[PDB]
């Protein structure tokens, strides 16, 4: 048995692990270290055409500016969104 | 209340989130009250997990 849960939802009480790194888990995890995750979800409830739109928006945020880690925060958001269109 | 007897404000009214634990952790055993029943209670990343657990209980 393998307990798979986010802080809010519990799914299970073979499994895939992305290193944590925003990536797929097939029996999606945003991050973390039983596998502990901050946002762990379906797979069914991800959308998706908005993940592509959120990717294009984050890439438009990047051509600032400027000061390191802002910047880093935008690239994180880009990495997360890339690994969401990759997922579905 | 912890600071007025002896810092974060705005805790308890809305239910605590992991986002609340993150805010605390980013600023930086843990002591909290563990729920038993209606009457009874008792006194890098996994560090934010432990702040969160002490918030939910």
């Amino acid at each position: 048995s393998f307990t798979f849960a986010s802080p809010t939802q519990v799914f299970f009480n073979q499994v895939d692990v992305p290193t944590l790194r925003p990536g797929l888990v097939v029996v999606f995890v945003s991050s973390g270290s039983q596998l502990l995750a901050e946002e762990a979800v379906t797979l069914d409830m991800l959308d998706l055409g908005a993940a592509k739109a959120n990717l294009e928006k984050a890439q438009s945020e990047l051509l600032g500016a400027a000061d390191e880690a802002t910047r880093a925060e935008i690239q994180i958001r880009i990495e997360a969104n890339e690994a969401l269109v990759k997922a579905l | 209340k912890i600071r007025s007897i002896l810092t974060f404000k705005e805790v308890g009214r809305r239910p605590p989130t992991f986002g609340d634990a993150s805010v605390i952790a980013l600023e930086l055993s843990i002591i909290f009250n563990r729920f038993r029943s209606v009457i009874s209670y008792k006194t890098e990343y996994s560090l934010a997990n432990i702040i969160y657990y002490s918030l939910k209980e």
Binding site: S30, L46, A50, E68 | -
Partner: peptide, 25 residues
């Protein structure tokens, strides 16, 4: 060493951001 952990940043901020991107999707 990762790009976010250069000037800053903790994995808590990293996690926080990724988590929010999943909720926004």
């Amino acid at each position: 060493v990762a790009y976010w952990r250069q000037a800053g940043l903790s994995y808590i901020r990293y996690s926080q951001i990724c988590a929010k991107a999943v909720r926004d999707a």
